[PDB]
Amino acid sequence: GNVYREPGSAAADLFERARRVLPGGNTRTTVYSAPYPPYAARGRGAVIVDADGEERLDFVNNYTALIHGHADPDINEAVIRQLADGVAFAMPTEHEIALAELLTERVPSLQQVRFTNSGTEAVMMAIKAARAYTGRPRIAKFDGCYHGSYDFAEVSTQSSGKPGEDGFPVATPYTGGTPQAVLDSVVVLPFNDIDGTERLIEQHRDELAAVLIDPNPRSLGLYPAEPAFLQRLREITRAYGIVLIFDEVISLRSDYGGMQSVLGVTPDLTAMGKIIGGGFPVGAVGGSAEVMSVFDPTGGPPRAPHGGTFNANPVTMVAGLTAMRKLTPAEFDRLATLGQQLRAGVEEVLREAGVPGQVTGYGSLFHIHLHQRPLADYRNSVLSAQERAFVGRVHEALMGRGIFITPALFGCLSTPMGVPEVEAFVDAFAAALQDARG
Amino acid sequence: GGNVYREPGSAAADLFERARRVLPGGNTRTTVYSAPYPPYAARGRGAVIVDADGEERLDFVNNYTALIHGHADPDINEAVIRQLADGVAFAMPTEHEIALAELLTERVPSLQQVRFTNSGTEAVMMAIKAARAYTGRPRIAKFDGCYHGSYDFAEVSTQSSGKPGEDGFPVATPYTGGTPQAVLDSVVVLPFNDIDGTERLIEQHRDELAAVLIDPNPRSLGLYPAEPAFLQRLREITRAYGIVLIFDEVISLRSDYGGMQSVLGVTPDLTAMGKIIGGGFPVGAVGGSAEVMSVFDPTGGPPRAPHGGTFNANPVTMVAGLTAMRKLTPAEFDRLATLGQQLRAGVEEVLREAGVPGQVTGYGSLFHIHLHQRPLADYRNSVLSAQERAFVGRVHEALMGRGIFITPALFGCLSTPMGVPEVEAFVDAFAAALQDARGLE
Ligand SMILES: Cc1ncc(COP(=O)(O)O)c(C)c1O
Ligand SMILES: Cc1ncc(COP(=O)(O)O)c(C)c1O
């Protein structure tokens, strides 16, 4: 029952230490919760164990990065093998080639790739590649979508409630002291609203190096880009020489060939991370050989220099190769089957109870919603204070009933999970829903 | 065995042919490309790196100073293997982040609080972002010709234009293609080790400057440190104007138990770190005064500067970094500094005996060979002529063929598996490489 909140808990003592040497005891904003979060001690398979000994089924998995759960034996074997050879070198290795070979074989848009140390870095380097390829300074992204901590990609991460006078989204700062020149350089588009998107892209078509889009953004309720919208976005970006960048840092796990394969639209660049590293720090930017040529150093200095001390380090390469090789087509099918079972079970729980709600998701990703507004209008994804309080009561009850999910009730399956784990989630959700309503 | 990887049908040639189909020019890290194709690392042990063609060399690069304990260090490997049984990443904080933060703040005086990132590039970016959030100001200042990673604002003028503008100050020059004019306009480029021009430029831009970012001993400028009077006056003027002073110690932190800032006696507001502090695993960190780092504090409301990161403070990096740093004791710093002095003196003697003009800079376990006698205190002297580039290239290629792996600039670093035998092997190989480069027996 959430024993970590108790005075004198292990988590409380750890937080007391942490706040002396980390700001507010924190080094990752995402994992803070008030007054202090629980601390992880270890994990095994689908189970996370906190510093106070409480065990929970992990439906977060480091925000979808650990598709194979905790301490996967195959990844551990591969990493242990690599440790004997060394973990980083100032020379390329074959391991970077092998993972690049896998990624380019699986994702149709990927003809060549480069590895980075984070999804944030992958997004930055795709933007910089688009600037180098097109010569143009500005980028466009969609209101309310998260892409990491790079200045230009994080503009309007949190939508302002209201459009400007033109009726279009407002470029709003996500970090303090954001330069006006940064805000002014970013065109903020409305997700799944093709008319406004087309009008804004047309207005800025000569200044836009790229459009950056997450195909199934978690921050907008995990409702995917609709097919007509995404096909018209592809057509207009191609028409105006604008690089289309897909942010699949989360969504790549939707399918053997990524969400771009699911939706049938081929971007010019793709940013990736999380699962492709086997649990170790990683990102990747890839796409057409034509656009990726900005990085090519063989014909003189590259148009876009891309250094990095731990780029393509063999630990990350070996772990990611192992993680991806374990993701066979049949494994994707199993994940999608279990995800469908979870989402349908949660919908039946909502129906049987008196609670209006809906569940979005695809493959092994899901998002529970305690309202029935159409998420095809992205402004409907914003929650009121009462709705936030209700979701929070459900989340805390779940935490106390052995289920670890994000505060928004966005979650993911891990390959160690089966029907028992899904049933455990659905039963715990029924009980937590009852708790939250009193 | 004389650079066998360059032969047709070598392992490296086959690997390059595969690589260029799936990587741009077969490359994923610009630094490690060399023409026509680079050698490929197969494995390492202690101070020795072994390439895919079986050729072994003493490693004086160590992933650009990150692996201060050399290859496959057993203590780091044992700690990592212990952690693997527990899991490698979590969506909760762990005690391991606390342990490494406790060590770093205990050792470096300016570090009151820290946050971990996944690269030195990220550390530099988040330091710049923290300074903007703390001061509210949009622009930053950095020094001409200095490298800080791939973040847009930090990389302006990484390669100097070579000549000043009409005002006599350095030029804000693009390092990547398509750099927006607004990015160039937001960066004030200062002259390293020229306190007069530095002060005049900061004075001119004092109301718009959130931060001055400075590498205390930049490799790009020949590894000649910021001189004490220059750095003290920089500290005074930034403090007077409310400008955040950021040290980039991603490389220089290894100079001393308390960093190069402790050597030079100047307390920055923030420090960016990386490389050694991760034990060989991807890592960065930004730390400093609790006053400035409070922009990150999420208690008591939303943080002024949000800072997420899926792999931030992952337990593998935290455990490997804790082990690596715990092994770097005061006695180890002393031993590395003695070995570095011995190497540098040996190289100076080789140059003197050969009649070849040159000099060697360095500190602790870092060194830089120069095949000229220009005073590097004038930073524009660090730029090499065509003749110097060709001659240094001959020396580097000969060293590579003589069992020595060093950077093309002849910038190098020691590792803890090294002793006097490795230093003497370096000095002997350098003498032979100099003879080769001059065409002498
Ligand atoms: C869609 C998306 N883009 C970018 C990132 C940033 O990746 P990282 O946390 O590794 O910097 C994340 C986490 C993400 O979900
Ligand atoms: C002085 C300096 N700053 C920043 C970096 C960037 O670190 P990373 O390669 O890990 O991004 C490097 C390599 C460096 O030498």
Side-chain angles (χ1 to χ4, degrees), chain B residues 180-200:
Chain B
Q181 190 64 44
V183 170
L184 292 180
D185 292 351
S186 74
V187 180
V188 176
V189 187
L190 313 167
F192 194 81
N193 263 330
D194 167 359
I195 189 52
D196 179 71
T198 290
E199 284 189 335
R200 288 182 277 142

Side-chain angles (χ1 to χ4, degrees), chain A residues 14-15 17-32 35 37-43 48 50 56 60 62-63 65-66 70-71 76 79-80 83-94 96-98 100-101 104 111-115 117-118 120-121 124-125 128 131-132 135-137 146 149-152 154 174-177 179 181-182 274 278-282 292 295-298 302-313 315-316 399 404, chain B residues 15-16 18-33 38-44 49 51 57 61 63-64 66-67 71-72 77 80-81 84-95 97-99 101-102 105 112-116 118-119 121-122 125-126 129 132-133 136-138 147 150-153 155 175-178 180 182-183 275 279-283 293-294 296-299 303-314 316-317 400 405:
Chain A
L14 291 164
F15 178 75
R17 280 174 62 195
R19 65 196 288 287
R20 297 196 306 258
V21 293
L22 310 140
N26 181 251
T27 180
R28 189 176 161 192
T29 311
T30 321
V31 307
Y32 178 75
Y39 279 70
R42 67 191 53 83
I48 188 167
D50 75 13
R56 294 170 184 97
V60 183
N62 205 26
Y63 280 89
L66 272 62
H70 295 280
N76 282 351
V79 168
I80 289 162
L83 296 178
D85 284 353
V87 304
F89 307 86
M91 291 171 183
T93 73
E94 182 174 357
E96 76 192 35
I97 297 175
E101 275 168 346
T104 55
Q111 300 179 320
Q112 300 173 342
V113 297
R114 286 178 79 88
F115 297 104
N117 299 291
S118 61
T120 283
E121 279 191 358
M124 169 175 85
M125 293 313 301
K128 292 177 78 208
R131 293 209 197 97
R136 303 175 184 164
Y146 177 70
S149 51
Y150 178 51
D151 296 53
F152 300 98
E154 76 179 356
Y174 186 56
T175 189
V182 170
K274 293 196 162 86
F280 291 87
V282 74
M292 295 288 301
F295 296 117
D296 182 346
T298 60
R303 289 172 275 172
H306 172 230
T309 300
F310 293 103
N311 292 11
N313 76 84
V315 169
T316 295
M399 284 286 294
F404 179 45
Chain B
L15 288 164
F16 181 67
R18 280 173 63 193
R20 48 197 275 96
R21 295 180 222 131
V22 296
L23 300 143
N27 180 256
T28 190
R29 194 178 156 191
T30 311
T31 320
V32 304
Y33 176 81
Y40 279 71
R43 64 180 160 95
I49 183 162
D51 78 10
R57 306 171 174 91
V61 185
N63 207 29
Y64 283 85
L67 273 67
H71 297 279
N77 278 357
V80 167
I81 287 166
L84 292 181
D86 283 352
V88 307
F90 304 91
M92 304 174 184
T94 84
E95 183 175 354
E97 70 191 48
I98 305 175
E102 274 165 354
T105 55
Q112 311 192 305
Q113 297 172 335
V114 309
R115 288 179 81 90
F116 299 96
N118 305 289
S119 63
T121 289
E122 281 194 352
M125 173 175 86
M126 292 315 303
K129 289 166 51 97
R132 290 210 202 96
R137 306 175 189 167
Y147 177 77
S150 53
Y151 179 46
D152 296 52
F153 300 97
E155 70 177 6
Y175 186 56
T176 187
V183 170
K275 294 192 159 83
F281 291 82
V283 68
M293 294 288 294
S294 66
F296 294 118
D297 186 344
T299 76
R304 286 170 274 173
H307 173 225
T310 297
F311 293 105
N312 294 3
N314 73 85
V316 173
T317 300
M400 282 288 290
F405 177 46

